[PDB]
CSV table of all heavy atoms in Angstrom, one decimal:
chain,number,residue,atom,x,y,z
B,10,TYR,N,17.5,-23.8,-1.0
B,10,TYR,CA,17.0,-23.6,-2.3
B,10,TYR,C,17.9,-24.2,-3.3
B,10,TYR,O,19.0,-24.7,-3.0
B,10,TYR,CB,16.8,-22.1,-2.6
B,10,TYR,CG,16.1,-21.3,-1.5
B,10,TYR,CD1,16.9,-20.6,-0.6
B,10,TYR,CD2,14.8,-21.3,-1.4
B,10,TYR,CE1,16.4,-19.9,0.5
B,10,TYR,CE2,14.2,-20.6,-0.3
B,10,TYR,CZ,15.0,-19.9,0.6
B,10,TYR,OH,14.4,-19.2,1.6
B,11,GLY,N,17.4,-24.4,-4.6
B,11,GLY,CA,18.2,-24.9,-5.6
B,11,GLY,C,19.5,-24.1,-5.9
B,11,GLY,O,19.5,-22.9,-5.7
B,13,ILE,N,22.3,-21.9,-7.5
B,13,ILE,CA,22.1,-20.8,-8.4
B,13,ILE,C,22.6,-21.0,-9.8
B,13,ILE,O,22.3,-20.2,-10.8
B,13,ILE,CB,22.8,-19.5,-7.8
B,13,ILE,CG1,22.1,-18.3,-8.3
B,13,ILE,CG2,24.3,-19.6,-8.1
B,13,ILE,CD1,20.8,-18.1,-7.7
B,14,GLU,N,23.4,-22.1,-10.0
B,14,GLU,CA,23.9,-22.4,-11.3
B,14,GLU,C,22.9,-23.1,-12.3
B,14,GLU,O,23.1,-23.1,-13.5
B,14,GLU,CB,25.1,-23.3,-11.3
B,14,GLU,CG,26.2,-22.8,-10.3
B,14,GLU,CD,26.0,-23.4,-8.9
B,14,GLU,OE1,25.3,-24.4,-8.7
B,14,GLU,OE2,26.7,-22.8,-8.0
B,16,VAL,N,19.6,-22.0,-12.4
B,16,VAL,CA,18.5,-21.0,-12.7
B,16,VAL,C,18.7,-20.5,-14.1
B,16,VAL,O,19.8,-20.0,-14.4
B,16,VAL,CB,18.5,-19.9,-11.6
B,16,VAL,CG1,17.4,-19.0,-11.9
B,16,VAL,CG2,18.4,-20.5,-10.2
B,17,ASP,N,17.7,-20.6,-14.9
B,17,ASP,CA,17.7,-20.1,-16.3
B,17,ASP,C,17.0,-18.8,-16.4
B,17,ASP,O,15.8,-18.7,-16.5
B,17,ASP,CB,17.1,-21.1,-17.2
B,17,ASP,CG,17.5,-21.0,-18.7
B,17,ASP,OD1,18.3,-20.1,-19.0
B,17,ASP,OD2,17.1,-21.8,-19.5
B,18,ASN,N,17.9,-17.7,-16.4
B,18,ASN,CA,17.3,-16.4,-16.6
B,18,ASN,C,17.9,-15.6,-17.8
B,18,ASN,O,17.7,-14.4,-17.9
B,18,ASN,CB,17.5,-15.5,-15.3
B,18,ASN,CG,16.9,-16.1,-14.1
B,18,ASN,OD1,15.9,-16.9,-14.3
B,18,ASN,ND2,17.3,-15.8,-12.9
B,21,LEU,N,15.2,-13.6,-20.0
B,21,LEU,CA,14.4,-12.5,-19.4
B,21,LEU,C,14.6,-11.2,-20.2
B,21,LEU,O,15.6,-11.0,-20.8
B,21,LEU,CB,14.8,-12.3,-18.0
B,21,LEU,CG,14.0,-13.1,-16.9
B,21,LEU,CD1,14.6,-12.8,-15.5
B,21,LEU,CD2,12.5,-12.7,-17.0
B,25,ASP,N,9.5,-8.1,-19.3
B,25,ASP,CA,9.1,-9.2,-18.4
B,25,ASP,C,9.2,-8.8,-16.9
B,25,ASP,O,8.4,-9.3,-16.1
B,25,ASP,CB,9.9,-10.5,-18.6
B,25,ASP,CG,9.4,-11.3,-19.8
B,25,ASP,OD1,8.2,-11.1,-20.1
B,25,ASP,OD2,10.2,-12.0,-20.4
B,28,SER,N,6.2,-7.3,-14.8
B,28,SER,CA,5.3,-8.1,-14.1
B,28,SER,C,5.6,-8.1,-12.6
B,28,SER,O,4.7,-8.2,-11.8
B,28,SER,CB,5.4,-9.6,-14.6
B,28,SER,OG,6.7,-10.1,-14.4
B,29,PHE,N,6.9,-7.9,-12.3
B,29,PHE,CA,7.2,-7.7,-10.8
B,29,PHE,C,6.6,-6.5,-10.2
B,29,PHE,O,6.0,-6.5,-9.1
B,29,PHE,CB,8.7,-7.7,-10.6
B,29,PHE,CG,9.2,-7.6,-9.2
B,29,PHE,CD1,9.1,-8.8,-8.4
B,29,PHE,CD2,9.7,-6.6,-8.6
B,29,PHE,CE1,9.4,-8.8,-7.1
B,29,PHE,CE2,10.1,-6.5,-7.3
B,29,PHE,CZ,10.0,-7.6,-6.5
B,32,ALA,N,2.9,-7.2,-9.8
B,32,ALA,CA,2.6,-8.0,-8.6
B,32,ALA,C,2.8,-7.1,-7.3
B,32,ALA,O,1.9,-7.3,-6.4
B,32,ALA,CB,3.5,-9.2,-8.5
B,33,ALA,N,3.8,-6.3,-7.3
B,33,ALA,CA,4.0,-5.5,-6.1
B,33,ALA,C,2.8,-4.5,-5.9
B,33,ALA,O,2.3,-4.3,-4.8
B,33,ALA,CB,5.3,-4.7,-6.2
B,36,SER,N,-0.4,-6.5,-4.8
B,36,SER,CA,-0.4,-6.8,-3.4
B,36,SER,C,-0.5,-5.6,-2.5
B,36,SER,O,-1.3,-5.6,-1.6
B,36,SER,CB,0.9,-7.6,-3.0
B,36,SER,OG,2.0,-6.6,-2.9
C,709,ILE,N,29.4,-17.1,-10.1
C,709,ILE,CA,28.1,-17.0,-10.7
C,709,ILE,C,27.2,-16.3,-9.6
C,709,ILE,O,27.0,-16.9,-8.6
C,709,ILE,CB,27.5,-18.4,-11.0
C,709,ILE,CG1,28.4,-19.0,-12.2
C,709,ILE,CG2,26.0,-18.2,-11.5
C,709,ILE,CD1,28.0,-20.4,-12.4
C,711,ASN,N,23.2,-14.7,-9.5
C,711,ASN,CA,22.0,-14.6,-10.3
C,711,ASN,C,20.8,-14.4,-9.4
C,711,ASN,O,20.9,-14.7,-8.2
C,711,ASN,CB,21.8,-15.8,-11.2
C,711,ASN,CG,20.9,-15.7,-12.4
C,711,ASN,OD1,20.3,-14.6,-12.6
C,711,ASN,ND2,20.7,-16.7,-13.1
C,712,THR,N,19.7,-14.0,-10.0
C,712,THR,CA,18.4,-13.9,-9.3
C,712,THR,C,17.6,-15.2,-9.6
C,712,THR,O,17.8,-15.8,-10.7
C,712,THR,CB,17.7,-12.7,-9.6
C,712,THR,OG1,16.5,-12.6,-8.8
C,712,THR,CG2,17.3,-12.6,-11.1
C,713,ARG,N,16.7,-15.6,-8.7
C,713,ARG,CA,15.9,-16.7,-8.9
C,713,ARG,C,14.6,-16.5,-9.6
C,713,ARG,O,13.7,-17.3,-9.7
C,713,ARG,CB,15.6,-17.4,-7.6
C,713,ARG,CG,16.9,-17.9,-6.9
C,713,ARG,CD,16.6,-18.6,-5.6
C,713,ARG,NE,17.9,-18.9,-4.9
C,713,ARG,CZ,18.6,-20.0,-5.1
C,713,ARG,NH1,18.3,-20.9,-6.0
C,713,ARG,NH2,19.7,-20.1,-4.4
C,714,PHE,N,14.4,-15.2,-10.1
C,714,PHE,CA,13.2,-14.8,-10.9
C,714,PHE,C,13.3,-15.4,-12.3
C,714,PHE,O,14.2,-14.9,-13.1
C,714,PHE,CB,13.0,-13.3,-10.9
C,714,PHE,CG,11.6,-12.9,-11.4
C,714,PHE,CD1,10.5,-13.1,-10.5
C,714,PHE,CD2,11.5,-12.3,-12.5
C,714,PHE,CE1,9.3,-12.7,-11.0
C,714,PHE,CE2,10.3,-11.8,-12.9
C,714,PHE,CZ,9.1,-12.1,-12.2
C,715,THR,N,12.5,-16.3,-12.7
C,715,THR,CA,12.6,-17.0,-14.0
C,715,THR,C,11.5,-16.4,-14.9
C,715,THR,O,10.5,-15.8,-14.4
C,715,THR,CB,12.3,-18.5,-13.9
C,715,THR,OG1,11.2,-18.8,-13.2
C,715,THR,CG2,13.5,-19.1,-13.0
C,716,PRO,N,11.7,-16.5,-16.2
C,716,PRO,CA,10.6,-16.0,-17.2
C,716,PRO,C,9.3,-16.7,-17.0
C,716,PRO,O,8.3,-16.1,-17.2
C,716,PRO,CB,11.2,-16.3,-18.5
C,716,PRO,CG,12.7,-16.4,-18.3
C,716,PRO,CD,12.9,-17.0,-16.9
C,719,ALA,N,7.3,-14.8,-14.4
C,719,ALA,CA,6.7,-13.6,-15.0
C,719,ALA,C,5.4,-13.9,-15.7
C,719,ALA,O,4.4,-13.2,-15.5
C,719,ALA,CB,7.6,-12.9,-16.0
C,722,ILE,N,2.8,-14.6,-12.9
C,722,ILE,CA,2.3,-13.4,-12.3
C,722,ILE,C,1.1,-12.8,-13.2
C,722,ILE,O,0.1,-12.4,-12.7
C,722,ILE,CB,3.4,-12.4,-12.1
C,722,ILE,CG1,4.2,-12.7,-10.9
C,722,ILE,CG2,2.9,-10.9,-11.8
C,722,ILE,CD1,5.6,-12.0,-10.8
C,723,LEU,N,1.3,-12.8,-14.5
C,723,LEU,CA,0.3,-12.2,-15.4
C,723,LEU,C,-0.9,-13.1,-15.4
C,723,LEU,O,-2.0,-12.6,-15.6
C,723,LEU,CB,0.9,-12.1,-16.8
C,723,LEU,CG,2.1,-11.2,-16.9
C,723,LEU,CD1,2.8,-11.4,-18.3
C,723,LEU,CD2,1.7,-9.7,-16.6
C,729,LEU,N,2.9,-11.5,-5.0
C,729,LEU,CA,4.0,-11.0,-4.3
C,729,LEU,C,4.2,-11.8,-2.9
C,729,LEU,O,5.3,-12.0,-2.5
C,729,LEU,CB,4.0,-9.5,-4.1
C,729,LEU,CG,5.3,-8.9,-3.6
C,729,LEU,CD1,6.4,-9.0,-4.7
C,729,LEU,CD2,5.2,-7.4,-3.2
C,735,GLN,N,8.8,-17.9,-1.0
C,735,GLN,CA,9.7,-18.8,-1.6
C,735,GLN,C,11.1,-18.2,-1.6
C,735,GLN,O,12.0,-18.8,-2.2
C,735,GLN,CB,9.3,-19.0,-3.1
C,735,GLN,CG,8.0,-19.7,-3.2
C,735,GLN,CD,7.5,-19.8,-4.7
C,735,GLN,OE1,8.3,-19.5,-5.6
C,735,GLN,NE2,6.3,-20.3,-4.9
C,736,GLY,N,11.4,-17.1,-0.9
C,736,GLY,CA,12.7,-16.6,-0.8
C,736,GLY,C,13.2,-16.0,-2.1
C,736,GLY,O,14.4,-16.2,-2.4
C,738,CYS,N,12.0,-12.6,-3.3
C,738,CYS,CA,12.1,-11.2,-3.0
C,738,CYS,C,11.9,-10.9,-1.6
C,738,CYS,O,11.2,-11.7,-0.9
C,738,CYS,CB,11.1,-10.4,-3.9
C,738,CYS,SG,9.4,-10.7,-3.6
Side-chain angles (χ1 to χ4, degrees):
Chain B
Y10 315 99
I13 207 68
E14 308 95 16
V16 183
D17 199 359
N18 298 339
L21 269 174
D25 277 337
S28 63
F29 186 72
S36 81
Chain C
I709 297 167
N711 201 0
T712 184
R713 298 184 187 274
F714 195 70
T715 55
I722 287 169
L723 300 168
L729 193 66
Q735 295 174 7
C738 66

